[PDB]
């Protein structure tokens, strides 16, 4: 069986390191390639360094693009463990999308000389997905994590929708949106709430009638869209970041 496996992640999180770790040693940065483990074959796309799943600089766009369009029976989320309340953004915003999902936290051996341990399993329970601490530059640590990685493809992803209520104003308008991307590749109300946000990404794939239907949406919440969900995000974030983390 054939596995298409999609590795995104912050900048300089690790990603490149950990592609060469498991392979080996089109222009734009979008490194593929493939390795075998027990019969079963790997497809490795290294979707650029972004952020957000958002538009930028072009890479952005391109890393976007993948994101949401290609089909992956597997999102490893490559996240520095170091700074976490900012590479849990993008994290954030890949657990709305419900595709499968692993946040593989890179940089232990550098982490545990900050005297900074975390709590895996708290962190994993707010998430609603498995998170896979390791070093990269430790290639016993990457021997052994294409065995984790093989168990969890065959076996699936459980996986539970992270608690972001938005305030009721903005659910009402999610739940009006979200019977246009029903059927869609990817969770109906993270398009929902990227039309919302007025992706031009998103709306590409909406006629006139459904581009206008939104755009009606988006003068209904009379408090600034992109402020609010950031203020959301953050509330939940914050107090992620409390709960899990200790210092030393
Ligand atoms: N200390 C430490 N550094 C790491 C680890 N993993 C990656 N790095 C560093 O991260 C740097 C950049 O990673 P890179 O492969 O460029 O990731 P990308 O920028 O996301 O593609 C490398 O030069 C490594 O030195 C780790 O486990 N521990
Ligand atoms: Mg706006």
């Not at 766009?61 to 290609?70: C, D, E, K, N, P």
């Not at 992803?157 to 009006?176: C, N, P, R, V």
Request: hydrophobic fraction near 40%; include cysteine; charge should be negative.
């Amino acid at each position: 069986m054939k596995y298409q496996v999609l590795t995104v992640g912050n900048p300089n999180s690790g990603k490149t390191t950990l592609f060469n770790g498991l392979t080996g040693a089109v222009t734009v940065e979008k490194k593929t390639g493939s390795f075998v483990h027990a019969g079963d074959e790997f497809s490795l796309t290294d979707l650029p360094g972004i952020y957000a799943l958002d538009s930028g600089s072009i890479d952005e766009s391109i890393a976007s693009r993948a994101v949401l369009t290609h089909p992956a029976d597997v999102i490893i989320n490559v996240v520095d463990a170091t700074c976490l309340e900012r590479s849990l953004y993008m994290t954030l915003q890949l657990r709305e999308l419900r595709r499968p999902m692993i946040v593989v936290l890179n940089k232990m051996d550098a982490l545990k000389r900050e005297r900074v341990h975390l709590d895996l399993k708290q962190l994993e329970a707010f998430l609603g997905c498995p998170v896979l601490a390791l070093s990269a530059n430790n290639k016993e640590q990457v021997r052994r994590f294409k065995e984790k990685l093989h168990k969890l493809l065959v076996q699936g992803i459980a996986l539970k929708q992270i608690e972001l209520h938005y305030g009721a104003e903005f659910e009402s308008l999610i739940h009006e949106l979200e019977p246009m991307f029903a059927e869609q590749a990817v969770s109906a109300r993270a398009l929902a709430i990227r039309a919302l946000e007025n992706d031009r990404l998103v709306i590409n794939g909406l006629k006139e009638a459904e581009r206008q239907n939104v755009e009606q949406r988006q003068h209904e919440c009379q408090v600034d869209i992109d402020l609010l969900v950031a203020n959301v995000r953050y509330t939940y974030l914050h107090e992620l970041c409390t709960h899990v983390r200790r210092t030393e």
